[PDB]
């Protein structure tokens, strides 16, 4: 539920930043 999601969500925010930060 919420704490997953928000999990997820963060892993993603940062895999996204890590890729566009290269």
Known sequence: GI???LH???KFA???VA???N
């Open 14 to 16: 940062k895999a996204f």
């Open 8 to 10: 997820a969500a963060k």
């Open 3 to 5: 704490g997953k999601f």
């Open 19 to 21: 890729e566009i930060m």
